A = this chain, B = another copy of it.
């Protein structure tokens, strides 16, 4: 069957495209730190370099995107949910939109702005499906139909999320929850088949490389295997779920409220529609200025990238017991204050930064806010019970995994975040805690606000089935 040649080529090309983008994003983030370490000659020369380099990468991302393909701003998922519902869009799967996203996303993330890649990876995979089916001319000529287009793009959304999180089953399951309302079991088998082939290519690349480029071997946790938690502390993992449900409902509300204000302020909007590159540059300058380590970044671990922040929050050691915890315990504050200020600052910075005219997603931004809030509860438990909830003392890094999944699930309207965190953290010992928090987060988030992508659909005035 020709469809099983299509799905191995769709799985091969998205693994290469993901690995090439990740190599280019890392080189951009490393150059910021090298430049800072070089320019320790004066605080003003170090500050000038810290604010300038992000603003140059974001200004180039917005300008280059506007020149090739103005359709390439924002996330794929809220359009793909309408393309699979049978609605044609103007230029969306064309090679100019591919070139615009692969270059424009690499500059948006390499700036060090608080931005995700999931929605963009769903669009880039769908463009690989479309452009593949024409480069080898499988489409049009031989009994081809809109049904076969929708069936090949649905497996591409599954490969898109699967390559993003390095989570081959949880990516297939997440794609179904966000793009669809009924899914064929035959389409879940085709997603699972192509996702498994993308996973195989990542192991070959990682074996040919020095390491997994996904730090700590794809965020692999190293907690104890025996008595990792007690039934006496299930009431704490439940309060993470509920609070993450309210938190994710506020994030989606605030992001829509920001866009509605920029549309309602018509005089400023007319000025900015002439001055098209001004708004993305000013937002980048503000965020980089507050993240400046010698000024205010010391109270937010501002010197860390988004990988480095999450690798630190998932450590097996306890911080409140009297390697990178040093970024959370500066000479002027304790770890609890630094967690509370990081949570409060990253919340408004991430609801704002995702509105700017660049290719960007939003899942890693809410995943790290959730991990920090989970770690705040975990260290607070380890401080209240210093030697046992007897003999088995508390493990705060396992509370961070539960908070990550619970806030990401509330914002997304999803339960496959539970499956992703097992494949990602490399362990299953916290399964019951994760599933209680994730279902409590969804039970109250779905009672308060739509999903993030359903807000983006209604903001963009795409055709909506509630």
Out of B177, B192, B225, which one reaches A415, CB within 8 Å?
B192
Q: Is the CB of B176 within 8 A of A185?
A: yes
Q: Is the CB of B185 within 8 A of A181?
A: yes
| Known A189-B415, A415-B189; contact A199-B435, beta-carbon cutoff 8 A | yes
Out of B169, B180, B435, which one reaches A168, CB within 8 Å?
B435
Q: Is the CB of A203 within 8 A of B185?
A: no
- Give Cα A29 to B4, complex, Å: 47
Q: Is the CB of B432 within 8 A of A203?
A: yes
Q: Is the CB of B184 within 8 A of A436?
A: no
- Give Cα A388 to B193, complex, Å: 30
- Annotate A150-190 by CB proximity to B: 1 below 8 A, 0 otherwise: 00000000000000000011000000110011111110110
Q: Within 8 Å of chain B (Cβ to Cβ): is A392? A: no
Q: How far is the CB of A239 from chain B (nearest CB, A)?
A: 16
Taking CB atoms, residues of chain B closer than 8 Å to A188 are 177, 183, 415
Q: Which B residue's beta carbon lies closest to that of A180? A: B185
How many A residues, CB 8 Å from partner? Answer: 42
Q: Is the CB of A177 within 8 A of B181?
A: no
Taking CB atoms, residues of chain B closer than 8 Å to A200 are 234, 432, 436
A195-244 contacts to B (CB < 8 Å): 196, 199-200, 203-204, 207, 222, 225, 231, 234
Taking CB atoms, residues of chain B closer than 8 Å to A443 are 4
Taking CB atoms, residues of chain B closer than 8 Å to A225 are 222, 426
- Give Cα A193 to B225, complex, Å: 26
Copies of this chain assembled into the complex: 2
Central interface residue in A182, A234, A427, by most chain B CB within 10 Å? A182
Q: Is the CB of A196 within 8 A of B435?
A: yes
Q: Within 8 Å of chain B (Cβ to Cβ): is A422? A: yes
- Give Cα A188 to B435, complex, Å: 14
Q: Within 8 Å of chain B (Cβ to Cβ): is A341? A: no
Out of B185, B429, B436, which one reaches A196, CB within 8 Å?
B436
Q: How far is the CB of A205 from chain B (nearest CB, A)?
A: 11
A99-140 contacts to B (CB < 8 Å): none
- Give Cα A177 to B173, complex, Å: 13
- Give Cα A168 to B181, complex, Å: 22
Taking CB atoms, residues of chain B closer than 8 Å to A431 are 168-169, 199, 423
Q: How far is the CB of A170 from chain B (nearest CB, A)?
A: 10
Q: Within 8 Å of chain B (Cβ to Cβ): is A371? A: no
Q: Is the CB of B182 within 8 A of A185?
A: yes
- Give Cα A266 to B204, complex, Å: 60
Binding site for B on A (CB under 8 A): 4, 168-169, 176-177, 180-186, 188-189, 192-193, 196, 199-200, 203-204, 207, 222, 225, 231, 234, 415, 418-419, 422-423, 426-429, 431-432, 435-436, 439, 442-443
- 3 tightest CB-CB pairs across the interface, nearest first? A183-B183, A182-B182, A196-B435
Q: Offer 19 A-B interface pairs, CB within 8 angstroms, sorted by A.
A: A168-B431, A169-B418, A169-B431, A176-B183, A180-B185, A182-B184, A188-B415, A189-B442, A193-B439, A196-B439, A200-B234, A200-B432, A200-B436, A204-B231, A419-B419, A422-B422, A423-B431, A426-B429, A428-B428
- Besides A177-B188, A181-B185, A182-B182, 4 more A-B contacts (Cβ < 8 Å) are A169-B435, A196-B435, A203-B231, A419-B419
